[PDB]
Design a protein around this ligand. Sequence first.
Ligand SMILES: Nc1ncnc2c1ncn2[C@@H]1O[C@H](COP(=O)(O)OP(=O)(O)O)[C@@H](O)[C@H]1O
Ligand SMILES: Nc1ncnc2c1ncn2[C@@H]1O[C@H](COP(=O)(O)OP(=O)(O)O)[C@@H](O)[C@H]1O
Lengths: 297, 298
Amino acid sequence: MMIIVGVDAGGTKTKAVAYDCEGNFIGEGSSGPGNYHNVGLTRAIENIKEAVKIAAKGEADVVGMGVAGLDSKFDWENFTPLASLIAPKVIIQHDGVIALFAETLGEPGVVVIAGTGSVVEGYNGKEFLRVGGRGWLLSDDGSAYWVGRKALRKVLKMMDGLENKTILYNKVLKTINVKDLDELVMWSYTSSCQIDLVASIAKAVDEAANEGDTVAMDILKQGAELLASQAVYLARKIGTNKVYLKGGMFRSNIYHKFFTLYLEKEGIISDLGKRSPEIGAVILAYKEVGCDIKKLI
Amino acid sequence: MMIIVGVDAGGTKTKAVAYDCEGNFIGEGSSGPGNYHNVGLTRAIENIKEAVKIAAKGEADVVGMGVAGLDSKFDWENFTPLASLIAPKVIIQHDGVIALFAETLGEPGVVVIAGTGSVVEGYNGKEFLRVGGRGWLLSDDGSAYWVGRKALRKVLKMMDGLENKTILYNKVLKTINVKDLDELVMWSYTSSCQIDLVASIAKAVDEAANEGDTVAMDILKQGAELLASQAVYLARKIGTNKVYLKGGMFRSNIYHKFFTLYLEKEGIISDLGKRSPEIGAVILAYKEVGCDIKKLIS
Ligand SMILES: Nc1ncnc2c1ncn2[C@@H]1O[C@H](COP(=O)(O)OP(=O)(O)O)[C@@H](O)[C@H]1O
Ligand SMILES: Nc1ncnc2c1ncn2[C@@H]1O[C@H](COP(=O)(O)OP(=O)(O)O)[C@@H](O)[C@H]1O
């Protein structure tokens, strides 16, 4: 039969699931990061290949992959030529695209992915579209990173006495394990360009907001609305009144509420994601080769 | 014959001027960075000593120094022990403090220094106070870096079609030499943690605003007001009605206009520099030892 493998090549790991063309599961596999910016081009390719081989228990006939790190034509040019060696037929898209297909099952739609970074991905039946998702410095509005940065800056002002200290102050310090301005400054000397670390602070903001801290509540509001406006823009551009929401930021009740209130006022319906990215990659492959998605899901 | 040396130990270089206790100029000298975060503790101390020795043409009796990089108690603990060895009497303060004293002549006051980064320094006659000045990630509101980041973020939204492209778009792309989103992303991969580069974009923002770009004017107005609010705060805590303004950001006519407008609404008088930091370091020393500042400045 035809062995089809869906792959989610991420920043920390690569996960793959193999199915035949009749919706039957074959196996699954995992390997290191598939994002070449993190482990180099060759290592990234090898990891994707490893995951695919484990899942397929040998060679695969078709491989659909959602890859993180392809944020510029230059990335695609560097990656595509080698990724194509993985199998006789390989379909390559952004990691956000398979996350979208996991929910739309290959049909048009828009998905908001708000985790460490943020992005709004869309598909209109022919072209794939995107807004945001270009990194922590240039973009990523309302991501965990964006939230943590705002929190850090607010805490500094409290330390300066410009504003009174709120629950947020200790929550943040607890997260990065610093007890005062002196340790915070020292912390910035070696951690300022530590993306994951800054992003981890979003959890402290959520905790503070739940406990009644309006300063924390306001940060979530601003981030959520900034990202939600982008979601509305793409949804309107694609022609759908429903968007899917995915990512760690949505684990925050207050963040999710501000986000949905914004969408609702704009006439947009939303649904939290319920399928895995890799399944969306298998769907990406099914669409390309002609296997019935109905037998799969 | 007492030899007093004022030193401005910065991130790029160190400047020193020597005078006696009677206000007579003795000499001047320069050396590398005095900021130990940029060249390491030993080399920073080494450069400061070199500058001092060159200006004083030998050993100095008293050295007043304004040092960049002492932004945490840990820095002071690392720096002070060795720096104190440069001369029998050494007075050490933040680089922003000597910039202030250069203008207040050792009297209470507040100074806003807005360049690549930003900070507000003050003296109340008893101690020195500070707001901001803790780095690009945690602080530096209204600094060139702050303005540069806001500009980059606006440009991205223009490329995404979320906002109309204005003059700022082309101004930014020209400054960092990129022609589109693809190149801007590639640029981010190698420039995101390069502070100087991001801050250089503030120049493009000023250009756009002078050509009437509403988007660029808003960035300058907002950044200026965010920082100005902090200057008002310190001025009020210090108990002064005047603040001094220094730094590359004030070279922007628009930024300066909005910064001053904010201060005047609060009844605060502003004033651009007029003196150099090294002179402020000499004043700092003079106050410590008791030499008459009126003989130094007039
Ligand atoms: N309840 C919560 N409230 C706010 N932020 C949260 C919450 N849970 C997790 N996060 C944040 O979201 C991020 C996790 O994102 P996730 O989507 O799981 O992975 P990634 O985005 O790196 O692929 C972390 O940076 C974390 O701080
Ligand atoms: N007219 C101007 N408009 C906007 N920004 C300017 C202007 N002139 C200089 N700058 C910015 O200010 C900074 C120079 O600050 P400066 O105080 O001279 O040095 P530093 O702060 O590094 O010690 C640069 O980052 C530059 O982009």
